[model samples]
Target chain A: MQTGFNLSIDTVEGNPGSSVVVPVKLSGISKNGISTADFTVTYDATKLEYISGDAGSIVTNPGVNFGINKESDGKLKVLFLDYTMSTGYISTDGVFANLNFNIKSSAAIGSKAEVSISGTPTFGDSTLTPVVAKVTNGAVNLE
Target chain B: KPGDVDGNGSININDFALMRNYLLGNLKDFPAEDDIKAGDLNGDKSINSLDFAIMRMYLLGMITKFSV
Candidate 1:
C-alpha cells in the first residue's frame, strides 16, 4: 500500500451464524501522532449483523471517548476523542479498533461481504493538527 | 444508537443529557467512533434542537424509531 497514515483491515474468514471481528488498524505517520479520528463505513446489513466494537489497544487513557453510530442502516459512523489535557499521540502503527459483525444464517456458503473504509476520515495529531491518511479495506469470505 | 451522543451504543437519558449539553456548548465529542448519522435526526446534516426533540420523543415512547 501507499502507507502514508495507512488504515487497514485484516482479512477474516468465518462461517455463517457466527461472529467475525475485523481489526481496522492504523500506521505510517510523519510528524505527530493522532488524538482523534472520525470515519464512516458501509456494509451490507443483509449479509452481516453488526454486533459491537471497542477502542483499539492504542486507546489507553482515561477520559478517552469514542462514538459509534451503528443504530441506523448500512452506514456506520465513528469518532474518538481524548479528553485528557495531556500528551499522548498515536504516531506508530497499531490496531485502532475491532468491528464485530454477525454473519447472517441465510448467507450462502460462498458469499462474501465487501467491507471497506469508504470515506474521508478526519484525524488530529498530538497537537490537534489535522492529518491525512490512506485506507486499505478488507472483507470476510464465508467458508 | 442514532441519538446516542454519549456513545454507549444506545439511546437513553444519558444521550438526552449529552444532547442538551452539546446544545449548551458543553459536549465537544462523543465517547466512541459513534456514527454521526445516528444522531443526525431530521437529516439537516447537523445535530441541533429538532434532533434533540425527536430523541426525547423516541425515548419517552412517543413513537417508534421511524423518523430521524
Candidate 2:
C-alpha cells in the first residue's frame, strides 16, 4: 500500500564545559505494515564548533557520528559519538531509527547547531529514501 | 625660563595665553610643537585647563613642571 515517516529533534540540553545530550526521535507509518529495513542517520553542526574531532573543527570538515535504535514498534533513536568546543554546524541526514548525541564540555559557546535525519524502507521492493530534520540548541554555557 | 614653542623660541605666559585663546576659539596662529610644545603643558597632549592648572601648580611649587 503506502508508507510514510516523520522526524523531529525532540530534545536538546547541556552545558559548555560539561556533557550535553541531544535527543532525536523518529516515527513511521505503513499501510501494509512493513518491517526489516536498513536505516542510516547523519548529523551536521550548525553553530557549535566541533574542535578535536573532524565533525566540529574549523580547518577540518564539520561532521559527527550517530547511531539508531528501533526502541519500539513505531519509534527510532539517533545519537552522536562525542563533541568538543567550537561553533557553527547543524542538521542530520538519513534515518530509520531514534537518535541521541552527546556534546562535550570543551565545545565552544554561542555555537548554533542543528541535526538532520534520513532513511530508506526495504519491503516488497527496493526503494532508497531519505529525510532530514534540524536540531535547535542555544549557546553553550559553563554550567 | 624661556620655554620651547612651535618655532623653538622662548615661551612665557604669552604662550600659555595663546593656547588658552586657541582652546577658547579667541586667538588664531597659535604656536606649534616647533615653536614649543604647543598646548601640551604637562606633556600629555593638547592644551586645556589641566595644563593651566599644572602651570599654576609649578608656579606655586606644588609640583615640578616638565614638557614633552
Candidate 3:
C-alpha cells in the first residue's frame, strides 16, 4: 500500500526561560505539491509558552505565507498560504514551520509539555483538494 | 497485572493516557524503564505504540484476561 501523509514534530529539551524550536514537517508523500496547510497545534500553557512561528520552506513550492493564532495560549491555529495559489503541492520532505516556544521557570524539572496538531488538520493539493494527514505530537522536556 | 502507568496502584484511564502520551513523544521526561513494567501489556519488555492500543483496549474492558 502507498504510504499516507506524515505530519511530524520534534522533541527538545531546554532550561527554564530558554527558547526552543520544534519543527513541523511532512513525509511519505512529497510530489503532488501541497497548495495549503491548515492545522492547529496544542501545547501546555503553564509549562510552555508560544513565542512565534516562522513559515519558511514548503518543498517544491515558490514561497508561502502563514498565520498563527494563540487560542487560549494552549492551542494554536496555524494556516499556511500560497498567495497566488501558484506553488505546486509540496511533494517531499521539508519543514513547514519552526514553532518557537519558551520553557517556563515554574516548570518543574523532569516535567514535560505536550505539542500536538489538532484533529482535522488538512493538507490541500495543488488542485485545491483537501487530504487528511496523520498528526505527530511532540514535547519539550524541562530541565 | 502490569500496565499500570502514572504510578498508580491499579490500571486506569490515566495509565492508558500516559502510555499514549509517552509513545507520541508528548511525555519527554517519562520514566522509560519503570513505565515498561506498567504499560508493556504484551510483556515484550518494550514500551511502544502498540502498548498504547493494548492498554486502551484493556481500559475499555474489551480485554479482561491476558498474559503479562
Candidate 4:
C-alpha cells in the first residue's frame, strides 16, 4: 500500500453564542506532493453557522488561489489551486485552511457538534496527477 | 525558445527549476542566449516571478500557449 496522506480537522471547544475556529490540516503528504485540492466540509447548521475560510500557511502566493463556496446551509466547498508549480509541490505538512464558525445561541451547553468532511477530497500533484489521501473528521464541544 | 529556459530543446520541470533558481539567485544564469529569451513567458520585457508563474502554469498544462 502507498504511504498515508491525511486530511484532518482540529477538534476545539466553543461557547454557545460565540465564534469557534476549525483548522483543516494536511499531514504525511505523498512523495509527489500536492498542488491542488477541492473538497467540501459539512457542519451542523443548527448548532454552528458558517463564517469564513482562509489559507493557512503552506498554500499562499499570488500564484496560489483560495476560494470558498457555501454549497448549502451547512456544506462548504473549499478550493485551493497553486499555479506556481515551478516551485514544485507542497512538500511540508501544515494547516492548509482555517475555517471559522459562529456557534448558534440555540446550541445546547454540554453538547457536542461535529463538523466533518463530506466527500472524497480531491488532491493533485504538480503534474496534474491525482494523489490519494485519507480523511479524519473532527468535532466541537459546546461549553 | 519560450519555456525552454535551459535551452534543453524541451519544456519540462528542469527548465522550470532553472528559471526558479535563477530568480532565487541560486543559479547564476540561464546559460544561453535563447534560454533567457525563453524564460520570458509573458514577454513582459523583464524576467521575474510572473514569467516564472506563467511557465509553471504552462508546464502543468493549465495553459497551452505562452503570451509571447
DockQ of each: 0.05, 0.00, 0.02, 0.07
Candidate 2 chain A weakest lDDT stretch, 10 residues: A121-130
The candidate maximizing DockQ is 4
Candidate 2 whole-model C-alpha lDDT, 0 to 1: 0.35
The prediction achieving the highest TM-score against the true structure is 4
In DockQ, how does model 3 score against the reference complex? Answer: 0.02
| Candidate 3 lDDT tens digits, A3-122 | 478888788886787889988888776466666666668888888888887774764333324555565578776655444455444566778778899888888888888888766675
- Residue-level lDDT tens digits of model 1 in B4-67: 6666667788886776555433456666465467667656575644455566557768668835
The TM-score of predicted model 1 comes to 0.65
Candidate 1 global CA lDDT score: 0.68
lDDT (tens digit, per residue) of candidate 1 on A85-122: 23555556788878899998888888788777766666
Query: What TM-score does chain B alone reach in each candidate, compared with the true chain B?
Result: 0.82, 0.53, 0.77, 0.88
Shift in Å, residue B61, candidate 2 = 99
Models 1 onward score TM values of 0.65, 0.28, 0.61, 0.66
B1-68, model 3: which lDDT tens digit per residue?
Answer: 47767665677777755654554345653443476676666676765534544554566576785468
Tens digits of per-residue lDDT, candidate 4, A1-143, equal 86478999988999999999999999998766777676778888989988888777877562445666566778877766566565646778998888899999999999988988876777767655667678989988899
CA shift of A124, model 2, Å: 7.6
Worst 10 residues of 4 chain A by lDDT: A60-69
At residue B68, candidate 3 shows an lDDT of 81
Query: What does DockQ come to for candidate 2?
Result: 0.00
| lDDT values, one for every candidate | 0.68, 0.35, 0.66, 0.75
Runs in model 3 deviating more than 4 A are: A59-64, B1-68
